Amino acid sequence: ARIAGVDIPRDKRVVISLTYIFGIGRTTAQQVLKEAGVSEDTRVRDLTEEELGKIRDIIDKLKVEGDLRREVSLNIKRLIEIGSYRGIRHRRGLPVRGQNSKNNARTRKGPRRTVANKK
């Protein structure tokens, strides 16, 4: 479990079912299915005994789950050892793309708490 992207779900149509794969998104799924000719097909999981394999190969050409996590990880590790400034933003809790800090930007900062008063 499973034949291609590991741990694809069940009782869902195949396109959203492999969008869950850490790699393929929506439009990429539209492309791999355009190569497939499945036409959707199948709402549940019942494709075909061999077609599941040929799709397994095309998905195999795409790459790849936790190694793709290793891509981003090795990339940011490349972005910290380089100096730096971008990875510096990655670990300050500072947003990296460049969008102030005086308000909001809590996506990294977190909620609580507060430690100031006047007067």
């Binding site: 479990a1 499973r2 034949i3 599941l52 394999g53 397994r56 195999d60 050409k61 795409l62 790459k63 790849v64 190694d67 490349r78």
Partner: protein, 64 residues
């Protein structure tokens, strides 16, 4: 071997999507298997599979 505690083990028929088969033993009469050592890229020598590691690093960026 205690009686009735241990499930019966009929001769297994391991199978795979690549058509590879293996003769073992299991509770089930037949066992389809998604992945085998003869199909997995690591056990099968050093197949490119999808990588092609290190392409490209740490630098190869030029355009004219």
């Amino acid at each position: 071997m205690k009686a009735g505690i241990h499930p019966n083990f009929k001769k297994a028929t391991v199978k795979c999507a690549c058509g590879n088969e293996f003769e073992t033993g299991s509770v089930k009469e037949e066992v389809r298997v998604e992945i085998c050592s003869e199909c997995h890229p690591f056990y099968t020598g050093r197949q490119k599979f999808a990588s092609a590691d290190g392409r490209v690093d740490r630098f190869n960026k030029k355009y004219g």
